[model samples]
Target: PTTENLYFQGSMNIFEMLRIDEGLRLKIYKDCEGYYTIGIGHLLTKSPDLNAAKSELDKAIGRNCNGVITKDEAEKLFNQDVDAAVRGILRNAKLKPVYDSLDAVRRCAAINHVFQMGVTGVAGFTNVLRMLQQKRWDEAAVNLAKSRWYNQCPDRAKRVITTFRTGTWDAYKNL
Candidate 1:
């Protein structure tokens, strides 16, 4: 359904232009103001202190850590750890309508790295994806931080945070 280029781009661009769109938002999303960064963002791999945040998350799994996170906080966290969270989400069977959107994108291009001009719908998040392909850590973190992650458990979100902070990106080397 994301095939009509301009129309789909326009649809996704609406959020991008508004700054509420997934790309720009992913750039700013965060779990805690200083805790962890995940998804399509540039802030996850900061300093040793960031690793502390990652460590904080490692202990969060299956634990009811209330003060540790909230929904809005969870949303920001998800943005920074997009790939890892997505993989976990897929592994855990979490609900993600974006996967359908992304799968639609995968069909258009042989690899997720190449940008297809005619592709629609998913184009709005293209900048972030391109950054991921380039291994532009910070930008990718920023972009990832802005995208949406919903219906995920707080602890699961925490794992995503940890994975994102410590995750490697060698997969994008040839892209």
Candidate 2:
């Protein structure tokens, strides 16, 4: 069985690194690229103007449309989402074997990647995954560093790659 506690800890670390907003905002806000987003930067489909902001809120909260929630509620939702994400990574048939074979740190990196990019996006890192499957840690790190993810999110990528290369999270113990 997987070390689920470690996996949850790793997921929380990644989530903090991503710095998702926790305050519930009733208004539709634009993301970095102007996409519609709301609570915890949850990207909304279709035009924000076309949908009631409360409707978007309803989707996230799974409740009567209040268009607002406490930080505690947001934290609850975030944990639920992260738990689901970790479970998704664990349950992915194509990734399960390789993921199961990894050490905790390496598994954390893989899970973080899957959480950030979704399965399809991570699957696009063919060379990195191939190297990982082959147990070429350094080569996998090198391949991952060369990707757009590294360019766009160097700090986050660095954390993942460092753990991938060293098989430990010593550098990020306090973070």
Best by lDDT: 2
TM-score per prediction, in order, is 0.23, 0.67
Candidate 1 vs. true structure, TM-score? 0.23
lDDT for every model?
Answer: 0.34, 0.65
Residue 166's lDDT in candidate 1: 37
What is the total number of backbone clashes in candidate 1?
28
Candidate 1, position 162, lDDT: 25
lDDT for each residue of candidate 1 in 99-157, tens digit (9 for 90 to 100) = 33332322112112111111232345567556544546467556545544312223222
Candidate 1: misplaced stretches above 4 Å? 1-124, 150-155, 161-165, 168-175
| Model 1: residue 19 alpha-carbon error in angstroms | 33
